[PDB]
Each structure stands twice: as structure tokens, then as C-alpha cells.
Amino acid sequence: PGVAKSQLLKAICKISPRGVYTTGKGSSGVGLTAAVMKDPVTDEMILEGGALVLADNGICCIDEFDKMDESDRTAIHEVMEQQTISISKAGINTTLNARTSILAAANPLYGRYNPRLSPLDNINLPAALLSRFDILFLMLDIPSRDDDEKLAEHVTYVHMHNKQPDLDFTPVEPSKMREYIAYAKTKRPVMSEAVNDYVVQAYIRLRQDSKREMDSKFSFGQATPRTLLGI
């Protein structure tokens, strides 16, 4: 638990504009899809948006992904296909739009990290949902002698003061950084022909060695072409 993952979620859901941070439970099924309510003075019957309709073209941070109700899981799986949430409830037949990006943070099975236990044994999620994520991480927690002094001098160096870095670096202020990244999104680069050969041969490598194991061991099968589109 102590790899400080919530700090990054509050962080990047504070740098990006239009970024919504929702915990596990938390929002209901109707809280993060839209609902219908009567409108005062201007009329009438507007679809009041939920969490996901609020934060589109942004980043939707999510805590505690395992504790979600299963209807919310199918909502997220409908966000994994683009643009689409479809509703057939008592007064709605619509197909609203959502162009969001999802960052999740799921915990393993209790307690932590048994190398006796297999992968996906300590994971409470199906490998289809592992295939919908093109990039998957894991943050271990192993006691090690050398890093502890750097970590202790790091943390106690900030409770001692209020700024961490030194020798030789200054942190970029976030407003100028948002000006940089906001400038960066107007480029649309174009690929070429040598990168065609290199991407193809690398995909032959990953496809080739990924399917010669075929086991429930520490290997993760079977390197779907979503990794190719993701890379």
C-alpha cells in the first residue's frame, strides 16, 4: 500500500484542466451516468450530467476499482469502446458522448504479493480488462537496505522545510507547464517507411516469444494486437 499512488492521482487530476476524481463507493450507477430531472425557470427536461459526462476530453481518476458494482464495470467497458454510453431506462433512449481517458488504481488480493500465488490469482479482474489496458503497471514493496537512507533524508528533509529538490534542479511551475503541453497538442506528426519495418519486426518478436509459454506462470499471455496499436 505504501508506494504513494493516491498522491499521483490527486496530482495529475490537479494539473490537467477538466479532471474529475471519484472514489470507489462513492458514486452510484446513476451518479456517473446521466439522469433526468425537471428544470426550474428555463424549461424543460434537460439531462443532468454525471461524472463521466462532466469530464470529457480530460482525465477521470478512479480509486478502488475492485469495490465497484458490476453495472459500473459494464459502464467502464462501454467507455473502453469509444464515444459510447447507451441507456434504455424508464425515460431515456439516448446515446450520449464521452471522449474521456481513464486512469485506475486497483489493489491486489489480500495481503500482498505472494510469488507462490500466480498472476491473476492475486488480481480480482479478468484478463479481458487487462487487455483493454494497453499499459499495465505494478509497484512492488520489497525491503532493501540502500534506498532507505535516501528516502529518510528525502522525507525528513521535507518535514524540516517545505521544498525538496536540490543540486541541481528547480521544479517547473504548473502554469508554465500547462502552457507548454497546451502548446504541444497542435502538431499531428506523420510516420514513414523505416519505422514500418521496425514496428513490424518488433511485433513479430513480441508475438513470437509471447506464445511459446502458454502458462499461468509469471508470463502474461498472449500479447494481443491492442499492444501493437497501443505501441
Next chain:
Amino acid sequence: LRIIWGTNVSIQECTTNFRNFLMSFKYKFRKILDERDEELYYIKQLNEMRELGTSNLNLDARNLLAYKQTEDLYHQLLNYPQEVISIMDQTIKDCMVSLIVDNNLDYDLDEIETKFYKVRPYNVGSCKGMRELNPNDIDKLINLKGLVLRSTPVIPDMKVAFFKCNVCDHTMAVEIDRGVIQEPARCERIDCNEPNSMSLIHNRCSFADKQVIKLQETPDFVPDGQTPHSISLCVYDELVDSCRAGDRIEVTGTFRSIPIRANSRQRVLKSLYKTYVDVVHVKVSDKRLDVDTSTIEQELMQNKVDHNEVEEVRQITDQDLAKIREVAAREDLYSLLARSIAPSIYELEDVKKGILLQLFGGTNKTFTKGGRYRGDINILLCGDPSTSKSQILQYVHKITPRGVYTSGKGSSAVGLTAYITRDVDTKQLVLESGALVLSDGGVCCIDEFDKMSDSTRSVLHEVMEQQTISIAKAGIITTLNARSSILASANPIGSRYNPNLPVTENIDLPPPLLSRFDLVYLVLDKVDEKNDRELAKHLTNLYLEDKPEHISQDDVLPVEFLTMYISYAKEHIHPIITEAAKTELVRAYVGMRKMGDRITATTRQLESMIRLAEAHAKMKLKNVVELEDVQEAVRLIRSAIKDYAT
């Protein structure tokens, strides 16, 4: 020079200059279209208006752009609809008079000159959608898209009034023209005095037709983060009953704004006006998506002949019909058409081929009493994820004329029919159509077929079997049909399919219900290496040179030949499956029954084989079936059967 007070128009320049437009038009719209029949349009279309007796000429707007002069009249038209439309009406009538003085003995000249002719323009731009519209732009012309939810009943409108007295008795009458109707207090008989009572007999006067249709649109290039929206529009006389519940319509009309009362009791007209549309021309057919059937339409084929209207069916031209009879002579049509469906997804040509055969569905035979046999076929496809199941469903959702796309765990037993609700603008109890009545004729789609309830999925035992729906609750006790071609998909427990495990076990369905579906695919993955090179070369073929080129080598792909090919293959063919194939068909069915002692085979396989077989015979323009081609109609199940060994 004369002018009108609200505007800058003049009657002379518009009249003479538009008269100068209707006598010369030589494909300048092609001079913008870059050229890739030399006689002008409106003499031909004015003759088609002339001999057939139909009214209602209609023209485009880009045609008014392309000609020079009258580049000016377009910008006059887009701003000022009512006055300019009245002017074009007057000069059309005088153009008919200026034609009839050529032969002098034409059509009993008085009444056909007397009959009202009118203009319906369309295609007047589409820059910004419904949301952006400022109150600066009140009265203009607007294009919209999107479907249609419900349809109010007919309400009349007074055009003529009618008065009497009790003394003694004389019967004057009065018109409307502006907003109000004045009535006299005195007199008739004597006129003058006495000031007798003036009654109104409201069973004698003229009336009109006013129908209100509620709409929901899909305004592309969204102003993020926009949510969907609802407009209400108010069609008039001729266009009554020109819109069902479900179609995809592109509308022109005039944006209006009229205040409403408060609480029906005082005269306090509330501020903060209400907006609506006031339609002019309805555009149902289209040239990019599919075209509607004919066995469904036949009630409104039986109607709509007494009163002249719009076409509702794509007009098949004559020149390219020769190209239809040319492409029908191709031998490789059975892999060419199935190859040309989804040119961005590349496997599963049996599945592409079955999706082609869902568009040619069966033969509609009606008996004397009972029977009522449709051409429904129904396809499941499952297997491992990351297999582009969704791309197929979005593409079919684009092509289908009346498709509705639900999902799993977003349904209820209420959620597919009878949304009996409270409409706000009239404050009564109005009944809506749910999710399958909108699906009536066409293709539905359902994702995650595993994760329904028991209550939901108990709807489909009626729709798949009886081809009815039986609503019985407090609103309406009356069965109503929803013919539909259900397509669905499901993801297994694995999620990878593992061998040496029963096929029925790996998807959580009761195998009678899995046995009820016609064509069941099981798409799995191969660990070999040779295909993946061509796979990645297709992907990086798509990403490169930032232009849609996707498949041009070494292949010919029709762009929009296939939609009119399918519709022409849907009206003018009735295939019959007579004697000579019953030996092979019954022979193969009893051969299928041989396996006994996983999945089994019932009579739905036999019904499946005849309807899929004659669906193959609907292709390639043959009014009878042959003993040959039934074999691959068996092989479409046998490919899955070879995919059931593992």
C-alpha cells in the same frame, strides 16, 4: 426604387431575374463539381409537373449558387423566407401561363391555371448546429438531423368563420388573414337595428390540418461537453402523416419564437420565449445508407396515391441499371461483395458473408389465414476479446436504415416497450414506443449477452419465436408486431477459450436458448506467425500518408453501388425453392439428426437452412433455387462445425 420595410428586396429585380434563371441552366453545379443531358432541368421537370398533374416543384440551393447572375438571390433567400417564396410562387404560375400559349388547346385552361403551385427548397447549408444559434438569427432556414420519437394526433385550425342570428336569418361569414377574428355585433335583417344576438355555428366552417412531431437530433462536431437535446416541430397540411416513429430525417424549416400563457387563467404572457421549427421540406430517403423494404410499406403504398407527396423509396435510374446487369455477370461476386463490406477489418469472411446474408433475409410468404412467415435470420458471434467485435457492430449500425443499439445491464422489462409517461407541454398521459418497436424492420444490436437478467432475456423468447409482442398493462391491451433481425455478442469466462472444455460450458447460456439462434460463430486465435505480418502491414498501411486509401490493391471496391444493388435485390425478386433440391435438403437434415448418444440440432436448423438457402438465391438475380449452391449453404454451418472440434 421601391423597397419593403423590414428588408432590402424589390419585386421587379427578383421577379425578372428569377425568370431569367428558369430559362437557362447548363450544369454549372458540375462546373463546381469538376466534371470528373445538355438540355436544362426545369423544362423537363416542368413537363413532368405538367402531364402527370402533380404539383409541388422542388429545387436545390447550390443550383442558385452556381449560376451567375443570381448569386445575390441566394443570400436574399436564406435570410427572408416568406416574401421570397411568395414571389417565386407568383412567377412559377406566370411561367406556366407563358408556356401554355404555344399550342392554345391544353388541359381546359382555366382550372389548371387556377390550381395553386408552390415551391419547396432544400439543401440550404449546414454550418453550425442547433445549439450555437443566437437570438440574432430568428427567422432563417436551418438544417437538422436525427430521429423522431412520437406523433401527436390531428388538430384543426380555423381558416373561415361562419355566423348567424335568430333574426331573421342572414348568414354572413369572415376570414382570418391576420392573427384574430373580428365579429360584428349588428346587424343582418334588418341592418340596421335591432342589435340582435350574433351566434357562431361551429359545425359549418372550413378547417385545416396541424400535426406536432417531437424530434431528437445528433448534431455532429459537438460543442464539448454537450449532452443530447430535444426540439419540437409543427408540420402542416400536405406533410401530415409523412413521418412515422423511428426514421432518420433531414429537415429544413424556419426557426420561430412565440410566447406562451401563464396558468390558462389570465393574460400574463410570460417573458423568456419558447422556440420551435416550422417545417417546409422533408428529406426520407438517402443515397449513402440503405433503403427501406416494401412488404412493410404496403399500407402507405395503398395510401399516398390520392394525394401527391414525396418519394419514400430511392429512385432507381436507368443508365446504371445496365451496370447492375453487368456486375451481376461477374463470377466472383460471392467473395467480391463479401470482401467489399468492411474494408478496414480483415478475417472472418464467413462472418462477413453471414452479415451479407442478413441483408438479404429470406422470402416473405403470406398465407391465406395464419402463416405470416418472415425472412428473419439471427446471428450470435462470440469468442476472445480484442477481436474487433465492436467495429462490426458500429458499421452495421451505420448501414442499417432503422437500427437501434442497446447494451447489457442498461435494460429493463419496461425498457423495451411502453414508456407511458407525462408529456410536459400538453400535460396529459402520452404513450411512447420503447426500444424494439423502434427496431421494427431492420437490425438490432445487443452487447454483453451474458449479463442480462432473467426478466430481461425473457423478452426474447417471444420476439425470437412468435414474432409478436404482447403488452397487457393498464394503458393498452393489444398485441403489436416488431419484426427485427437481432444480432448479439458475448464474452466468455476465460476470457481466452481453452481447448478440451465443452463449448456449451464456456458461455453462460442455457443451451436451448443457444440452440435457438440460427448462426453461431466461435472466433478464436491462432498462435502461428505467417498471418501477423500481413496484419501489421495492413495497420501501417492505414496509418501512413494521412489519407483514406485503405484498399485499392489489388482489389475493386464499389462505394455505393452495393446499397442500390441490395435494395434492387430486395424488391424485384421472389425466389421459389421447388422440387429438385428437397432430396438433398431432407437428406442432409436426416444426416444431421444422426449424431446422438454439447450442442444438438433441432427443426430450427431446417428452417434455418431453407431461409438461408433462399437468401443465397436472392443474390445473383435468380427467381428459382438450384440443387447446386445448397451445399455451401450447409457449409456456412459446417465452418463453425469444423470450429467445434478443437
